[PDB]
Amino acid sequence: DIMVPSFVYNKLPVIHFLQEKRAEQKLRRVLDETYTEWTEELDQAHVTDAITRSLNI
Amino acid sequence: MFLFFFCDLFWLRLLLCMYYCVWSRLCFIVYFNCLMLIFDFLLFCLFDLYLFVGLCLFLLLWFMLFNLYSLILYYCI
Numbered sequence A: 001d002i003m004v005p006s007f008v009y010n011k012l013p014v015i016h017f018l019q020e021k022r023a024e025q026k027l028r029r030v031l032d033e034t035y036t037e038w039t040e041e042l043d044q045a046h047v048t049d050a051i052t053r054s055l056n057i
Numbered sequence B: 001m002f003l004f005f006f007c008d009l010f011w012l013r014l015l016l017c018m019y020y021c022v023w024s025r026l027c028f029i030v031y032f033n034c035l036m037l038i039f040d041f042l043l044f045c046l047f048d049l050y051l052f053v054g055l056c057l058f059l060l061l062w063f064m065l066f067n068l069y070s071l072i073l074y075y076c077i
C-alpha cells in the first residue's frame, strides 16, 4: 500500500525519459537507412548504332 | 499467562491510511546505503544483495513512528 507504490512512482520519470530516447532512436535509424537509388538504363545511342549497322550502312 | 494489549500507533495508522490511499514519491531515506552497495561500475553480485531493502524500509518506518513521536509527552514506546 505504501512502499512499493512510492518506488514505482520514483521510477516513472527515468523510464519515461529512456523510452522516449529509444523511440527517437528507432525513428533516427529509420531515416538513416533511406538513400535515393538512381538506376542506369542502356544508352539509346548504342541502339541507334545497332540500327545503323543492321541497315548495312 | 496471556496479556492482551495494543500498540500506541492507532492514530498514526489512521493517518497512514488517510494520507497514503494515493501514491506519493519518496526521495529522503534515513539509511540510503541499503540501495547503493556497489560504487564501482561493471561489478555485480550473484547473491541477493538487495534483499535487505524492504526490511530496512519497514524497520525504519516502524522505529520512526515509535521513537520520534515518543518526544511528545505521555507517548509510549
Ligand SMILES: CCCCCCCCCCCCCCCCCC(=O)OC[C@H](COP(=O)([O-])OCC(O)COP(=O)([O-])OC[C@@H](COC(=O)CCCCCCCCCCCCCCCCC)OC(=O)CCCCCCCCCCCCCCCCC)OC(=O)CCCCCCCCCCCCCCCCC
Pocket (backbone or CB within 6 Å): B002, B003, B004, B005, B006, B007, B013
Ligand atoms: C473472554 C473475554 C474475551 C477475550 C477472549 C480472548 C481469547 C484468547 C484465547 C487465547 C489466546 C492466547 C494468546 C494471546 C496472545 C496475545 C498477544 C497480544 O495481544 O499481543 C499484542 C499484539 C498487539 O498488536 P497491535 O500492534 O496492537 O495490532 C493488532 C491490532 O488488532 C491492530 O492491528 P491491525 O490494525 O494491523 O489489524 C488489521 C486491521 C486493519 O484495520 C482495520 O480493519 C480497522 C479496524 C481495527 C480493529 C482491530 C483493533 C481493535 C481495537 C480495540 C477494540 C475495538 C472495539 C471493541 C469493542 C468491544 C466492546 C465490548 O483489521 C482487523 O483488525 C480485521 C478485523 C476487523 C473487524 C471488523 C468488524 C466489523 C463488524 C461490523 C458489524 C456490523 C453489524 C451490523 C448489524 C445490523 C443489524 C440491523 O496483539 C496482536 O498482535 C494480536 C493478538 C491476538 C491473539 C489471538 C487471540 C485470539 C482471538 C480472540 C478473539 C476474541 C473474540 C471475541 C470477543 C467478544 C467480545 C468480548
Ligand SMILES: CCCCCCCCCCCCCCCCCC(=O)OC[C@H](COP(=O)([O-])OCC[N+](C)(C)C)OC(=O)CCCCCCCCCCCCCCCCC
Pocket (backbone or CB within 6 Å): B015, B016, B019, B068, B069, B071, B072, B073
Ligand atoms: C523533521 C523534524 C520535525 C521537527 C518538528 C518540530 C516541532 C516544533 C513544535 C513547537 C512546540 C509545539 C507545542 C505544542 C503544544 C501542544 C499542547 C500542549 O500542551 O503540549 C505540551 C506538551 C508537553 O509540554 P509540558 O511538558 O510543558 O506539559 C506540561 C503538562 N504537565 C504540567 C501536566 C506535565 O508539549 C510537547 O510535548 C511538545 C513537544 C514537541 C516535540 C517535537 C515532536 C516532533 C515529532 C512528532 C511529529 C508529528 C508530526 C505528525 C504529522 C503527520 C504524520 C503522518
